[PDB]
Short mmCIF file of C-alpha atoms and ligand atoms in Angstrom, two decimals:
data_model
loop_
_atom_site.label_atom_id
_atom_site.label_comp_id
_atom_site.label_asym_id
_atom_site.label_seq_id
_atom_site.Cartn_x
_atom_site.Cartn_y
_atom_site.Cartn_z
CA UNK A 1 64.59 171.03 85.62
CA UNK A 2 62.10 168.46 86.01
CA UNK A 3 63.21 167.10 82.20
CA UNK A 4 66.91 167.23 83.28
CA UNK A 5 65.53 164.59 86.94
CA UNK A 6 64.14 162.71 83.90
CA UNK A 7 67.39 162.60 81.75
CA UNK A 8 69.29 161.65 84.70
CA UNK A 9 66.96 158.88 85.76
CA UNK A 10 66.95 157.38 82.11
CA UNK A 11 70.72 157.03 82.65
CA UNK A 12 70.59 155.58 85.77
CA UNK A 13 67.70 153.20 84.52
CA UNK A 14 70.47 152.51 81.24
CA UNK A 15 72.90 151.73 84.18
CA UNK A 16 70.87 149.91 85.94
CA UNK A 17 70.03 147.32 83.27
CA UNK A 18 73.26 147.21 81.76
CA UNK A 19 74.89 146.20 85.66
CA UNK A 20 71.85 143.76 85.73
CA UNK A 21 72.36 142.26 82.53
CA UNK A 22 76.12 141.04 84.01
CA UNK A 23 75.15 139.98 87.15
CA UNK A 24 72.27 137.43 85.42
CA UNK A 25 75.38 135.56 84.08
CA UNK A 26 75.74 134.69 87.35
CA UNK A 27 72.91 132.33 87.77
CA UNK A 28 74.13 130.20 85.62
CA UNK A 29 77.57 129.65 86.98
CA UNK A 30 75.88 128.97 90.75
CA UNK A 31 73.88 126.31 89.53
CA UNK A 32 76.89 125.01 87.25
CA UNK A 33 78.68 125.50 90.67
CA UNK A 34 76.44 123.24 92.89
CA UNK A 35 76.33 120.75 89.89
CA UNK A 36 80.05 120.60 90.15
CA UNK A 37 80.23 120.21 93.69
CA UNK A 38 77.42 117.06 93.69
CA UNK A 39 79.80 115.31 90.62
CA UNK A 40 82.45 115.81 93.25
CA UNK A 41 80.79 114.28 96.30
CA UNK A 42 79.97 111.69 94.29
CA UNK A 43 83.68 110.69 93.67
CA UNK A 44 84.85 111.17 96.83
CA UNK A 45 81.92 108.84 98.38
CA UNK A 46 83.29 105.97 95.74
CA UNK A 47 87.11 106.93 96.83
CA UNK A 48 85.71 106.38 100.15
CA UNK A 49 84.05 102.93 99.63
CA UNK A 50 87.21 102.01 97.83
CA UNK A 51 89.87 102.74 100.95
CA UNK A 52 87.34 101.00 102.76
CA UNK A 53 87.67 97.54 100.26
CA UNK A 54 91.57 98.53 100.71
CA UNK A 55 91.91 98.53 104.15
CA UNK A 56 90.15 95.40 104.67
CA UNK A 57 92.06 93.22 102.15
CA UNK A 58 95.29 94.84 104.18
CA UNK A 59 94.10 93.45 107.26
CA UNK A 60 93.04 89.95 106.39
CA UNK A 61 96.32 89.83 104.16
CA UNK A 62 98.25 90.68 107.49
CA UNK A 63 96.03 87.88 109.49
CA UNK A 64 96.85 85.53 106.79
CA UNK A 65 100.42 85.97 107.29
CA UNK A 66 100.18 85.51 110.79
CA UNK A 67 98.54 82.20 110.13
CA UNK A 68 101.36 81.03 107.56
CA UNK A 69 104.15 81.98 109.88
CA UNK A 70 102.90 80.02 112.63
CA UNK A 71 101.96 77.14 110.89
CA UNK A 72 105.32 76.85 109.38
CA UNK A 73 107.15 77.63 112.49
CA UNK A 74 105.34 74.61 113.73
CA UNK A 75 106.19 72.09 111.12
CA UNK A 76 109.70 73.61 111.35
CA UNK A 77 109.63 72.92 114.82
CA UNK A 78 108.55 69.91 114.26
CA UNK A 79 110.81 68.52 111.51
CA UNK A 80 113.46 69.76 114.17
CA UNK A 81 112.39 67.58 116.70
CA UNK A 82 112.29 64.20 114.23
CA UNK A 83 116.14 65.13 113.68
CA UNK A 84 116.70 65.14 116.82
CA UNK A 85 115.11 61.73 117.47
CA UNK A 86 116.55 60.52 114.55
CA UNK A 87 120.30 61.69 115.78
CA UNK A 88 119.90 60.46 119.27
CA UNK A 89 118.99 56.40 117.52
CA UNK A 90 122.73 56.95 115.20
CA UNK A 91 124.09 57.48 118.46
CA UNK A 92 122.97 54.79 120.36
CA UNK A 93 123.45 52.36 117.08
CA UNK A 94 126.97 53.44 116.92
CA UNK A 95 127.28 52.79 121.24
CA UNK A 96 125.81 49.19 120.39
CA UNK A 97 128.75 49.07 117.53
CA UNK A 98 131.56 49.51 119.48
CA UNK B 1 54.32 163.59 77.18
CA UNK B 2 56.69 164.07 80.74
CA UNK B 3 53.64 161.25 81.85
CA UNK B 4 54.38 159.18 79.23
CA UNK B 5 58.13 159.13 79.94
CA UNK B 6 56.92 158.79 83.60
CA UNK B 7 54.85 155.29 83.01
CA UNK B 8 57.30 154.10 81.15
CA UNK B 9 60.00 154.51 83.60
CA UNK B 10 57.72 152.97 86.33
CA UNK B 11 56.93 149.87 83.70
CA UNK B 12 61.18 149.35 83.56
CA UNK B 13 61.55 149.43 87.35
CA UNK B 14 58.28 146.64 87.65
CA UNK B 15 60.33 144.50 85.54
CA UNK B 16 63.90 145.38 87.27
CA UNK B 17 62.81 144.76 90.64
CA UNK B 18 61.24 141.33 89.43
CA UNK B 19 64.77 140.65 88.04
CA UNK B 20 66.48 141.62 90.94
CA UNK B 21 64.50 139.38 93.47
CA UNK B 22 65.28 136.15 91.10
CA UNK B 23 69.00 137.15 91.38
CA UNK B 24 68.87 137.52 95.35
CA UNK B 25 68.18 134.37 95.53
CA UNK B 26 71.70 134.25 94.43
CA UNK B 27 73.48 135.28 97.85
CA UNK B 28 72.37 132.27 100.05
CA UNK B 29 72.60 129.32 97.18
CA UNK B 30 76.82 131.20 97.02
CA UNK B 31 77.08 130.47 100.82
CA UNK B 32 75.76 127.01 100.92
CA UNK B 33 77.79 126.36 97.98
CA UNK B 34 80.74 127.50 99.75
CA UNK B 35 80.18 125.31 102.78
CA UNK B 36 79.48 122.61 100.59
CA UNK B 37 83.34 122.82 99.27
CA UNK B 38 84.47 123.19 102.72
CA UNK B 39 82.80 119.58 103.56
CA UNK B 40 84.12 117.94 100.36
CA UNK B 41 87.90 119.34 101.19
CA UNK B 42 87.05 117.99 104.95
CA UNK B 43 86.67 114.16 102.92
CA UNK B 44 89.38 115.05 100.65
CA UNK B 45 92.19 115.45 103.53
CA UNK B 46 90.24 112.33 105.30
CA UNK B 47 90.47 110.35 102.43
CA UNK B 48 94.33 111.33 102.11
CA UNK B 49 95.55 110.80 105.55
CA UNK B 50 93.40 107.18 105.25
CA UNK B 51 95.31 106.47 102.04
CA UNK B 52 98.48 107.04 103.34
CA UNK B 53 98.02 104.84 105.94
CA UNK B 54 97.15 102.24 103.71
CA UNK B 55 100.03 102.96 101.38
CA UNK B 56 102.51 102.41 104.86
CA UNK B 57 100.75 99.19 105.82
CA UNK B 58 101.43 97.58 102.11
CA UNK B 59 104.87 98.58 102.33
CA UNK B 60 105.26 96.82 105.74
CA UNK B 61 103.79 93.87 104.84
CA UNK B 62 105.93 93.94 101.54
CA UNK B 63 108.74 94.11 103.81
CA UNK B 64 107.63 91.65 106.37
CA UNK B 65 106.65 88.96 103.15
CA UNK B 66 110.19 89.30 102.22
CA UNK B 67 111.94 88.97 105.50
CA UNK B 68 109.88 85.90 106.23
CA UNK B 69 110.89 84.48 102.92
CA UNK B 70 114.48 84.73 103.67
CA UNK B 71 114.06 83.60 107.10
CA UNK B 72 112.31 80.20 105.82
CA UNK B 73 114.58 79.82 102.80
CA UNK B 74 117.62 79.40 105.61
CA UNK B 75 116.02 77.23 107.83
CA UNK B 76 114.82 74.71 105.16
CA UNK B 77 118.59 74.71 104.19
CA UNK B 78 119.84 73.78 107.60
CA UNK B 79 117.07 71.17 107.76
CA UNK B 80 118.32 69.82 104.24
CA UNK B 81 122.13 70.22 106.03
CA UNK B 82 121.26 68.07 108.81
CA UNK B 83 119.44 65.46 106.38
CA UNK B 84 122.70 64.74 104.62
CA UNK B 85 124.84 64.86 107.35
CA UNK B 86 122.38 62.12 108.70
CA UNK B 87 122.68 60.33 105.08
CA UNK B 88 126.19 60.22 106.16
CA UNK B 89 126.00 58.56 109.40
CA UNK B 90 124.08 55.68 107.75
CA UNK B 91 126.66 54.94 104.95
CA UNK B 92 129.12 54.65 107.75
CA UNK B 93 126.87 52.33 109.81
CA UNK B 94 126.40 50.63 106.87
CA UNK B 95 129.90 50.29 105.71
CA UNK B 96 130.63 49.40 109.86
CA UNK B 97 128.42 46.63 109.53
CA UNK B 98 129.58 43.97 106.87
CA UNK C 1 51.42 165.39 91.65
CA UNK C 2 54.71 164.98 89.11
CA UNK C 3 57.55 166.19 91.47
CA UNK C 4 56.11 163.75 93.79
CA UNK C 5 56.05 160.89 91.65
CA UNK C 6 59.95 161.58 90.59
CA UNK C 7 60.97 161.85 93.92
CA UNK C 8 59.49 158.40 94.48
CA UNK C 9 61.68 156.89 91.33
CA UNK C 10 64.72 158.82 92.50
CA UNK C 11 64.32 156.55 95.75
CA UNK C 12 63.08 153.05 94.16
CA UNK C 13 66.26 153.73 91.83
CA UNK C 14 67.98 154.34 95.39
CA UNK C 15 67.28 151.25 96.76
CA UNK C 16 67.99 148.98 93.71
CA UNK C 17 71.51 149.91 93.43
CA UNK C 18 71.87 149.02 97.42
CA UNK C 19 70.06 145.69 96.19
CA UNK C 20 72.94 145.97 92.83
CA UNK C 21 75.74 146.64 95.09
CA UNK C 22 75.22 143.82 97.80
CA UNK C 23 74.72 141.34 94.65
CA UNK C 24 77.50 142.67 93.16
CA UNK C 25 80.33 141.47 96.12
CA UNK C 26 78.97 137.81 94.78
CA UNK C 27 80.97 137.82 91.27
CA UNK C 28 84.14 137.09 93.09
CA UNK C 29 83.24 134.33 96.02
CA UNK C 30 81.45 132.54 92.58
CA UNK C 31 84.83 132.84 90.85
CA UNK C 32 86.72 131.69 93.92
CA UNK C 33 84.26 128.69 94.36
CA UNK C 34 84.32 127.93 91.00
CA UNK C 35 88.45 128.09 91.54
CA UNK C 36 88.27 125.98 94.50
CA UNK C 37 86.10 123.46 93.05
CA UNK C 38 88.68 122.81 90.77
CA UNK C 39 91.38 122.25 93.10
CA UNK C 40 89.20 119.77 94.61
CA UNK C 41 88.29 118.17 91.76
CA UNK C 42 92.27 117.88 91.33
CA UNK C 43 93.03 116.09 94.70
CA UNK C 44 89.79 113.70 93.82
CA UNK C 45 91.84 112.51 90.86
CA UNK C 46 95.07 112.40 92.67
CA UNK C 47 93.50 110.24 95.15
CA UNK C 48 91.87 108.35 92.75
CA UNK C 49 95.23 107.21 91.02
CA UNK C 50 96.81 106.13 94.51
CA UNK C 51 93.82 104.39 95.13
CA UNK C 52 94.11 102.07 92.27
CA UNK C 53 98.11 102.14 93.05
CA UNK C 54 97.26 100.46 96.73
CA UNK C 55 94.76 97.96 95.10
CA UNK C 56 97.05 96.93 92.26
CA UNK C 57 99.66 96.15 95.22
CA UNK C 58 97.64 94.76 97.96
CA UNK C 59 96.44 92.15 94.84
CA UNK C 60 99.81 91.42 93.97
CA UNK C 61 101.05 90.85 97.40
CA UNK C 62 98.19 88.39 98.23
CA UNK C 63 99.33 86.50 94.76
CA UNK C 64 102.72 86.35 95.79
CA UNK C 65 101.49 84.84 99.87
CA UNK C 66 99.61 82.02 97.47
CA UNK C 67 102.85 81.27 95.16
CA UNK C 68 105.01 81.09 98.65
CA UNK C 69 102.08 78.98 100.60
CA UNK C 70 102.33 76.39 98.13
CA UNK C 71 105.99 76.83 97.30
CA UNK C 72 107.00 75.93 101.00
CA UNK C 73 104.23 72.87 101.43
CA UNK C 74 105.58 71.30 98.83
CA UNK C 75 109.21 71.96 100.18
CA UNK C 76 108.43 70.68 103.42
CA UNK C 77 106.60 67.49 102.22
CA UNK C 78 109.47 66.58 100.48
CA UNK C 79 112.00 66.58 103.48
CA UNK C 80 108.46 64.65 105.62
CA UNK C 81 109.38 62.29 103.01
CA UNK C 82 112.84 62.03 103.32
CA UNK C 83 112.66 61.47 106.83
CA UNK C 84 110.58 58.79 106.89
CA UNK C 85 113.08 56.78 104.04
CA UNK C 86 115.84 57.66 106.99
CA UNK C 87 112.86 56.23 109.42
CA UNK C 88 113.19 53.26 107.51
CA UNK C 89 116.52 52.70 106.69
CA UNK C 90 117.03 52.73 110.62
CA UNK C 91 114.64 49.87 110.88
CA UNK C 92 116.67 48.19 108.74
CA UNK C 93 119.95 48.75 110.40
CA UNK C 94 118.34 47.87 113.92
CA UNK C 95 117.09 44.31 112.18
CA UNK C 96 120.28 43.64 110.41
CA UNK C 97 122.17 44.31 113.55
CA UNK C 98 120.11 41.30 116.03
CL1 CL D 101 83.96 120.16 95.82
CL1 CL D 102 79.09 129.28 93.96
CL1 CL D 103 88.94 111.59 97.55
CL1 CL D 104 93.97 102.54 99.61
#
């Protein structure tokens, strides 16, 4: 009986090696794994720095708006009030007219 | 003979235990690996919500660029309006006069 | 000394298919981080394309603020222009009057 323990072991050894053999493959993929994830950080970082350039050329873009409005507004504003001027002297050259 | 059988199973298992300890290395590389992903899909979303902000803000701007176009385009023609109606004034003075 | 010794292997053998089994329960959380790298990977690139969407727009829209900023300067130093010529022409009407 103690040859049949051995035949059974020698099995289970053949097993053994066999279920070993698969999970080695294994290695392999981990480290392909954490190589893959380090590629990926990388990208995202640069996406990251990229938003970043992004949001600040959206915000000096909107400042730089709200510059040109109000600096035309004011030359509007001002051309407006010339007019005006200009308007109230034809009236009072027509008044000395007449 | 049995003995011989007996060493050499005890030979396979030395080398199948030194196996198995390189592959348990294997279980905490898989978790750290795993929280790794959750930190990149962490940036990922961050990086998307930031983006879409960024994508609104362009469009308003877009918007507001166009509105204040518009809005500029009709007061420089009232302006120009007002000139002629002014160029008018003086022909008449002018005619008034001789 | 023999049934001793293959009661012994019977254990070691035992032990390294606990060791087996517990590595075994890694093969799928490697194929599911593998998967999930992937999708990652996926929403980098997405992100990536409406990156380069926003900067493509936020360059055009600053262009376009230039070509108005001069566009209107020049439009409103014409009409300065044209109201000093008015300016004058008033002179002119107030020295041909007395
Ligand atoms: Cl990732
Ligand atoms: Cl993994
Ligand atoms: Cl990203
Ligand atoms: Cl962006």
């Amino acid at each position: 009986q103690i040859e049949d323990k051995i035949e059974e072991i020698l099995s289970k050894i053949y097993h053994i090696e066999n279920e070993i053999a698969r999970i080695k493959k294994l290695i392999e993929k981990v480290d392909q794994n954490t190589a893959d994830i380090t590629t990926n950080t990388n990208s995202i970082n640069q996406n990251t720095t990229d938003i970043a350039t992004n949001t600040t050329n959206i915000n000096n873009l909107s400042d730089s708006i709200t510059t040109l409005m109000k600096q035309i507004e004011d030359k509007i504003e001002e051309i407006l009030s010339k007019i005006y001027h200009i308007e109230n002297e034809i009236a009072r050259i027509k008044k000395l007219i007449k």
